[PDB]
Amino acid sequence: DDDEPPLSYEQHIENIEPLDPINLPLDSQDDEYVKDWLYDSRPLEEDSKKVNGTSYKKWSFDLPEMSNLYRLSTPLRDEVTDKNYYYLFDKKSFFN
Amino acid sequence: IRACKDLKHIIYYKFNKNLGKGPGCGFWQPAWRVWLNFLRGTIPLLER
Amino acid sequence: RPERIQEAIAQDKTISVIIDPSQIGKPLLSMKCNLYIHEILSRWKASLEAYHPELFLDTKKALFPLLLQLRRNQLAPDLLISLATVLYHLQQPKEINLAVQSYMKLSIGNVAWPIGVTSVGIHARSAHSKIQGGRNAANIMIDERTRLWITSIKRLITFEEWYTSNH
Amino acid sequence: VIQALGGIETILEHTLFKGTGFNSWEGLFWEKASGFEDSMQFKKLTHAQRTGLSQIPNRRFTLWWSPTINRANVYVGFLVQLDLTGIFLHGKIPTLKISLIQIFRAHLWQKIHESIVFDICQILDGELDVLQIESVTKETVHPRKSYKMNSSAADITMESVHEWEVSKPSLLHETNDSFKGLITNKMWFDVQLRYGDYDSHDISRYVRAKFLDYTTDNVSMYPSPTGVMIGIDLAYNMYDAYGNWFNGLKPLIQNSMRTIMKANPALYVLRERIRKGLQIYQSSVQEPFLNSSNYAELFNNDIKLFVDDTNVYRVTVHKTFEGNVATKAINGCIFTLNPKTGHLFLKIIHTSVWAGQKRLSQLAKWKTAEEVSALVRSLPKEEQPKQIIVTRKAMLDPLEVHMLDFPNIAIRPTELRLPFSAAMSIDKLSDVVMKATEPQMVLFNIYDDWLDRISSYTAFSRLTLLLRALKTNEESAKMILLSDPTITIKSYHLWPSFTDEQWITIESQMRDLILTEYGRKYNVNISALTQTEIKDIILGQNIKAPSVKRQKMAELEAARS
Amino acid sequence: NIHIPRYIRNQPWYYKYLVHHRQLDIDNNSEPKIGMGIKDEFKLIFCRNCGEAGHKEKDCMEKPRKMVLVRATDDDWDSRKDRWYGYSGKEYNELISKWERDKRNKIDEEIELMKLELYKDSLYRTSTRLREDKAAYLNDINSTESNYDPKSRLYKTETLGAVDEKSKMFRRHLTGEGLKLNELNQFARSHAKEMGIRDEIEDKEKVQHVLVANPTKYEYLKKKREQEE
Amino acid sequence: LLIHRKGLTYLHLDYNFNLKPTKTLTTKERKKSRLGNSFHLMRELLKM
RNA sequence: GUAUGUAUUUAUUUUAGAACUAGUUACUAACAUUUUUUUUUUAAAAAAUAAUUAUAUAG
Lengths: 96, 48, 167, 561, 229, 48
Ligand SMILES: O=P(O)(O)O[C@H]1[C@@H](OP(=O)(O)O)[C@@H](OP(=O)(O)O)[C@@H](OP(=O)(O)O)[C@@H](OP(=O)(O)O)[C@H]1OP(=O)(O)O
Ligand SMILES: [Zn+2]
Prior knowledge:
The structure is cut from a larger assembly and holds four copies of chain A, one copy of chain C (about 170 residues) and one copy of chain E (about 230 residues).
Chain A (H helix, E strand, L loop, with lengths): L8 H5 L49 H10 L18 H5 L1
Chain C lengths: L1 H11 L14 H20 L9 H16 L5 H15 L4 H12 L36 H23 L1
Chain E lengths: L5 H4 L23 E2 L7 E2 L26 E2 L5 H4 L9 H17 L4 H9 L41 E4 L4 E4 L3 H20 L19 H14 L1
Chain D binds one RNA strand of 59 nucleotides through helix 3, helix 4, strand 10, strand 11 and helix 20.
């Protein structure tokens, strides 16, 4: 409502237990390597083999984790692997 | 605004393929990007 | 409980219905007005056949909060002075018109705007907000019960004009 | 082109024709006269004031295509709401806001709302039987509830004797519902008004949406979960409803809604203001006016009153410090009398009425109507009138809006010009008006003592002769009354106490003055006229009427045989 | 009709009066329309991991592995933007159940007032409607075709007047002083015609013979004519 | 606090960040109370 | 009708004339609502035709 002041976090919000986010339920063995950390805030913030530190600046994975993220992100991949697709849609045809 | 409206067209017909006409898209990443890039341009103007 | 009622009826035959105009401008005046209203109701009750009989019960029900306020000395003084002036010109023998005139002073009053008027035209000015009627209005617009008993005083006035016409 | 656009149906679903309530599109075609701007284009008129005249046709054009202009499928636009109504207009058109304000002026949205609320509540008072209702209590809600479109409270509460076996929510016309599912103690009724665009005008979806929002949400405070929601579309003349029924509600409510939707005065004032804002005629003149052939209708048993406004706003001209003069208002009177018994309620309007305001010749109309509504409210129901005759036609529209509050009182505009303005020029009346220091109601009896020896109808026609004389010559007649110093007036009394022989002679002097001055002024002798024509003259009746035509045809039929 | 132009009275070639315009619902627009209702219709409607033949591998709604009713197209702007579509009743049932549980958890006269009733043997925002009265179009809700005129707020009854059939005008019946004016008006006209000849051509004075021009003389003359008989 | 420093007390700024007058303004007051593009632009950003 | 401007003090600061008379001009004023087509003679003659309007204007 327009005449309602914004309710205080410390009274009306903070004491309520949160609700369920989106979280697509993963398989147990097809998605084995990425299951325990896919939906965290900073997913490997403290795992010094797969990250530099909590400054969170560089990353390095193995092959099965990277392959699992490759399969799992099918609806948003590019899926054009030859450069002759963009024959007259490259940037320089647009400039011409 | 026109950018966000155009983005809706290219998101919905990827979302609504084989599932109708209702609400419920919620893929809000590209529109969010558009309004953040508006905000960083109107920081120095509104400070002036 | 019937003892106080009996002693109050014995005091009720003691006090008299005389409105003196110098006495208008406090509890004894309210009791004298209370009793004159009761006597008007009794002169209806003596002759209930010739009138409308359908108005009498509703008149008593609409008058009963007014009679209660006059029995308890709780009526506001500006309103009570006007009512006593109506009831004085009613009590006098021939000036039945001055009763209705003081009644028009009772019901509407001397306010400039009796009922509020809002949004007269297309063109809005600030002074139009002075017009409206929440702030100062007629006594007939204070509350819906007050409308009933102020109307019922007029109804007793019409009764009294008929009674002084015939009997 | 009309076949190209699709026809009159697909043209008129864009227009505001549905909200007017003409019967047929064929009545869109008339010889329409412009009226105001025709009079105003010839006057001496400022440069800035003449270009303002050309935005009068544009407001009518913007009103007519207003569903299509103020539609809902917009590209960009921030919806705002008008002040005293509930219309959301997408963005800002300045012509359309003026048109819809002129339509909904004098707080008409809220009068429509509480009109339909009291009508529903009076039907539910009429049916405390077979619906088994214990009490129907009308709620006192916030005065902005009529147009708070965010949320709403209930305004009618139905408390029952024992229990109501209450169905599942469905629309007003769905014909199949089981009463066995639920049990409540009380029910609520609520009335919602929407103004429809070209797109958003599916009223059934609107009422189901308002019910399913306002019951489940926490802002809308209802007494029980069980109730019904009644919705009305003002732009498109539609109604529907949604909610919890029991045995006996639905056939009562659908009949209630169709008769309230056809015969509410408030919705008629809305549709009439729409027809005026579009400038289109519709002749709906069920009762004839108070003409000279109806003339004795004033002397029936039922109580009725003449109201007159001509002396309400008066001014005095005075020189300023500059060249131009200025007008200052003085005291006024609202002239209301009843002709059968001569009671004259004289409202003295002080100048503290006109204190800060301006325009002062528009506001006087609403002052008279508001004061007549106060006078009628102060009367009892058996003593309230059954009819009110308005003298000037500009007093129709304020009295109609203020007598929305009293639906049982008829209003007839008069057809014959009445001389009551000359009642200012009686010195006993003018004295009490001018000496007043306080806004007040003063009573007079304009038939002085006539009702003893003289019956009331000849007394009214005597008063007609006197006031026509004082409006015609004003000093010759005032000297005709004041010939002899022997006849005085009393303290209670208006007129000189003549004997009845003297009234016969002086009425003869009055008709001589009136008819000779008329025949001298308009170059038409009285002697060649019909008795109908002289009775037409003295009552101030106007020719070009249909009544004069049908009267002369009836007299021709009566005298040919 | 006279008013319609000739570009509307003309029918085009392929309609070979004004039958061509008639199909909102004009020509009974005086009758208000009602809610049409609520109708919510749902209709029915290769990939490596789904196994269905319809879509492409990028379009499969199942999760990628290592190895259906649809809103029927109604195009009212209220129907595509309706917040409550395909509503079964879950929210209202949860509301009623919560209220039923809460309801299941839930379950003088003064001395002087008695004195006055024993003698009598028994907020400026308040509206001006005067609740205890009743409007006139409410008494005939049940039948049809009400008698209330919304323009001039009269309620045509049988006692109050009668309708002329050809003019459709409601002229009231007269009562007492109206009868004593009408029969006296006819009396003044008859007395005038017998007193002079008043045949309305003879062009002489006749100002004393119109009633309203001098009513007191005609009242006393009517009165003495009553006294003589 | 900006609106009330400037002397404008008849403008109401409700909690959904709309600026509406509490009465019918005079013209002198409508001159004194035209807030700029900058105020209303900041105001719509806070609303968003 | 706006713009815009102007007016609204009480809480105590020490010691050549006299008389009579009525209308004509300008200007100003948000202050106020008795048909159509003819013909003919020198007032009279002919012919004709059809349930009722705006509170809206500003530099
Ligand atoms: O394209 P826009 O002008 O932004 O309007 C669209 C559009 O409606 P139209 O193209 O028919 O005007 C969509 O419709 P489709 O492309 O799907 O036919 C859609 O509606 P859906 O929800 O059915 O996709 C959508 O709705 P939303 O606002 O929920 O994105 C939205 O409508 P509006 O912009 O008018 O709200
Ligand atoms: Zn698939």
